[PDB]
Amino acid sequence: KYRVRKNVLHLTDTEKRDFVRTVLILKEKGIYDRYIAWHGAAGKFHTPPGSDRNAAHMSSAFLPWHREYLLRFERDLQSINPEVTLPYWEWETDAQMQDPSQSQIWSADFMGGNGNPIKDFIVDTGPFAAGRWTTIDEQGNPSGGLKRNFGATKEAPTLPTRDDVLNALKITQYDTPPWDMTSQNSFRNQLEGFINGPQLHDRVHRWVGGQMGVVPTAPNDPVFFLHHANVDRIWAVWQIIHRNQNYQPMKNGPFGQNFRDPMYPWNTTPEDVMNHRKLGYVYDIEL
Amino acid sequence: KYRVRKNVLHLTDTEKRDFVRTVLILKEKGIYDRYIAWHGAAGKFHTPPGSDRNAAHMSSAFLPWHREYLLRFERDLQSINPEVTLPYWEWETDAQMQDPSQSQIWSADFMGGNGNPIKDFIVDTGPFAAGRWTTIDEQGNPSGGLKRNFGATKEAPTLPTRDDVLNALKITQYDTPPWDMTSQNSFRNQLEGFINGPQLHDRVHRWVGGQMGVVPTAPNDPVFFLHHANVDRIWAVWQIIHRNQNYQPMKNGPFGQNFRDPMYPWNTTPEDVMNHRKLGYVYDIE
Ligand SMILES: [Cu+2]
Numbered sequence: 011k012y013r014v015r016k017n018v019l020h021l022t023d024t025e026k027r028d029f030v031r032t033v034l035i036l037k038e039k040g041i042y043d044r045y046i047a048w049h050g051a052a053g054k055f056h057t058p059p060g061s062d063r064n065a066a067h068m069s070s071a072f073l074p075w076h077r078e079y080l081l082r083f084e085r086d087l088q089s090i091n092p093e094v095t096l097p098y099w100e101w102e103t104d105a106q107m108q109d110p111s112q113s114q115i116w117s118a119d120f121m122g123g124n125g126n127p128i129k130d131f132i133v134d135t136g137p138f139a140a141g142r143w144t145t146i147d148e149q150g151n152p153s154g155g156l157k158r159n160f161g162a163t164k165e166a167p168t169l170p171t172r173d174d175v176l177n178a179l180k181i182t183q184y185d186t187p188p189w190d191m192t193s194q195n196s197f198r199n200q201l202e203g204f205i206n207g208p209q210l211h212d213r214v215h216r217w218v219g220g221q222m223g224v225v226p227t228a229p230n231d232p233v234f235f236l237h238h239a240n241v242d243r244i245w246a247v248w249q250i251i252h253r254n255q256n257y258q259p260m261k262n263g264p265f266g267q268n269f270r271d272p273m274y275p276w277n278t279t280p281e282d283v284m285n286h287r288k289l290g291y292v293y294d295i296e297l
Numbered sequence: 298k299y300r301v302r303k304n305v306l307h308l309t310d311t312e313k314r315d316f317v318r319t320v321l322i323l324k325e326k327g328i329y330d331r332y333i334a335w336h337g338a339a340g341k342f343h344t345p346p347g348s349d350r351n352a353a354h355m356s357s358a359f360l361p362w363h364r365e366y367l368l369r370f371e372r373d374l375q376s377i378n379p380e381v382t383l384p385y386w387e388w389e390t391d392a393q394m395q396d397p398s399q400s401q402i403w404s405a406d407f408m409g410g411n412g413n414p415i416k417d418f419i420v421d422t423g424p425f426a427a428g429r430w431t432t433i434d435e436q437g438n439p440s441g442g443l444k445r446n447f448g449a450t451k452e453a454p455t456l457p458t459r460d461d462v463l464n465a466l467k468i469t470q471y472d473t474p475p476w477d478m479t480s481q482n483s484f485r486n487q488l489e490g491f492i493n494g495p496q497l498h499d500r501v502h503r504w505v506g507g508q509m510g511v512v513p514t515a516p517n518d519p520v521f522f523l524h525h526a527n528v529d530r531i532w533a534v535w536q537i538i539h540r541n542q543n544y545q546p547m548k549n550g551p552f553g554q555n556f557r558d559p560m561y562p563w564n565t566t567p568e569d570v571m572n573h574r575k576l577g578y579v580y581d582i583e
């Protein structure tokens with residue numbers, strides 16, 4: 011419990027110019043791509059083969075898989091600049107605005123704005139605008155520039171609300187059988203957004219649109235990591251208030267989903283990442 | 298060093314049965330599938346994006362990437378049965394047969410045989426025959442059964458020969474710019490099989506056919522690992538003949554290809570797996 015992680019809205023200007031600069035360095039060095047690829051790779055590892063569950067989504071491991079992913083990413087940030095931690099995008103509060111698109115998390119000094127509808131929704135403002143930031147597709151080849159299209163779908167016109175988050179936090183069980191999108195009374199499935207969906211996580215992806223709207227390719231947008239830090243924060247909060255609850259399934263879920271199974275593409279297990287402060291970080295709202 | 302990887306032809310019946318049994322356990326457990334997936338994932342990781350080099354093939358990291366892969370695989374075998382090590386298929390010796398398909402490697406108590414023509418070359422003999430061994434496709438779903446067609450293509454009608462291997466072993470440089478399929482006078486490119494191809498490695502994949510003939514999905518056939526153990530063995534031989542030669546490139550190559558770059562999907566570097574006897578194994582010959 012040392013490295014913090016702060017609300018994007020509470021970050022000094024200097025902190026943002028430094029976060030963005032560090033992300034650009036990781037991209038230049040070839041490291042950022044590894045994260046895009048890892049995510050896509052996990053999506054093709056079905057547990058078991060033929061199931062809709064995969065190593066990183068639509069099943070128990072969703073939360074610890076992303077925790078590990080962010081942890082590795084934050085370590086790579088810190089190897090460049092030890093003062094840089096991963097911030098979180100508190101979307102539930104942005105949802106309160108008339109036009110969430112006006113949030114400072116899209117400012118030209120940070121993540122840049124919505125896509126330009128005249129350009130096939132290509133982001134042309136901010137540090138990740140086309141020409142300054144190249145994306146890759148699922149073959150692993152350059153794919154022409156970041157796209158975003160806020161709230162453009164009928165299923166996800168708006169971001170999740172504070173009440174949506176509070177309601178998820180009331181759920182007592184981490185997950186329930188059959189450990190997939192049909193799980194009910196499950197914190198995991200609720201937060202992932204498949205109970206009467208899309209809700210929460212799944213809704214944020216859909217709301218942002220562009221690369222974020224396609225799960226495999228989503229990490230092409232740096233906001234992906236901000237989004238997931240918020241998901242991780244919500245989980246950490248759930249763990250704090252439900253101290254006697256533990257990860258499920260403990261055993262006899264599909265291989266890759268159990269407490270002590272390795273999470274492809276790594277050897278890391280859910281047990282390894284259950285306690286976030288032991289990992290070396292904390293969320294501001296804890297302090 | 299004292300894990301000993303043996304020629305398939307020098308394995309006892311018991312060693313063969315134990316190897317097979319262990320591979321089937323790994324598959325049942327869900328672990329084998331991690332190896333298929335890793336391979337596929339590295340194939341989609343281009344170094345740099347847009348080029349025809351990838352993390353595991355058609356570039357300098359081809360050899361160390363596969364050495365790491367096999368090392369992880371053998372450690373998984375060992376965790377099931379501590380006596381099992383990864384054997385190697387010395388194809389260059391089978392190439393001397395009148396009919397290589399009669400090699401003991403394709404025994405009904407080891408890898409099983411060639412595919413059946415009237416069942417569209419589905420393997421119906423051995424421990425990995427259809428109904429006893431499922432395969433997965435590039436997308437990670439079930440794809441219906443192991444298939445093999447020995448020597449069916451015009452470009453690779455035969456296995457590489459002893460002289461093919463000897464000639465590769467004479468090359469003085471590990472690799473050369475631009476560190477890709479077009480590299481000349483490079484041991485890596487010669488062994489991988491792209492100098493006047495397809496020869497050696499690439500030739501073996503093409504000769505076996507079926508899943509083996511398609512690089513990403515190749516792992517689906519257990520003989521993949523025995524083939525790569527032979528490739529690793531041949532590299533280890535080269536490393537001793539040219540003991541004053543080291544991995545290349547050392548710096549200014551694409552990220553993921555240099556001596557101290559991590560090899561996607563892992564953090565392991567080529568430096569890490571340079572010396573194989575520091576990794577805990579040797580080949581019987583040595
Ligand atoms: Cu994801």
Ligand SMILES: [Cu+2]
Binds near residue numbers: 336353354512
């Ligand atoms: Cu390969």
